[PDB]
Design a protein around this nucleic acid. Sequence first.
RNA 1: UUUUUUUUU
Lengths: 107, 179
Amino acid sequence: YEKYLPDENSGKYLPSSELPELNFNYLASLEKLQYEEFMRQMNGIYPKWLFLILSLAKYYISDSCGDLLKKSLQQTLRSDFDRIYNFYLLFEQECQFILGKLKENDF
Amino acid sequence: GDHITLLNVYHAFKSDEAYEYGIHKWCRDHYLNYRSLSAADNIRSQLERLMNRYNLELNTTDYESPKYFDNIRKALASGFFMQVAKKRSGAKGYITVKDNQDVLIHPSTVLGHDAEWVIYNEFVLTSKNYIRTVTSVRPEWLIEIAPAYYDLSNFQKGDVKLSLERIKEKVDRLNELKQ
RNA sequence: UUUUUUUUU
């Protein structure tokens, strides 16, 4: 970080940070912060399920497929808060998989 | 539940009302086989005699109790845990826990809604690979009753069953973690 | 839309 204010070599530094302290990777991922959303999705796939949920919700709020991804996160991580995010997905689009999103709550 | 439905059928056949109607007439009015029902009564009598012989308690619970159907389902899982099907997450058709085979629900099954976890009685091959006589069940009950067969270590790598079975496990462990 | 067999007065 002292070596330069920022270009590819810094990405190599973030790469070494990610290859091997989760904070060390998350910070480099933050400085790096759709392909970034995809790599961040891979980071969520590596899993801090809550922080990954924050990265995903930020990725959507930056999408119905992404809502399906967050619903998959509800299927994995963790219930009423999931019902609230499901309410957000419902308000975002009242269309037929939403009942399956409600199914994760399953009073 | 198909099994629950069968229980309803026999309980209605052995009812005083069905005897006041015409039993055989009552069977010929509700589209039921009298031969099968009487044979079932006979078999039930034999099995009851055997249970009384080897000293098994005849026990039951009130219909008013909400744990009635749940008790029945659990007792079903006690013997039929090896025969369980899971609906494909976000797709069509079912797949069996045992030997991992793609299957479908038999057209004569009562369940009109998609219950993702079911216990079945018969496996039948005809036009397609069909699953006959089913009843919805909670994976929690399955894990509780047969932990020996439902340890994650037994099953093949990340498939549709194991993927959400492990989610149910995460759930269980979170429940234990909070207590 | 797809039950071959059998399972104690």
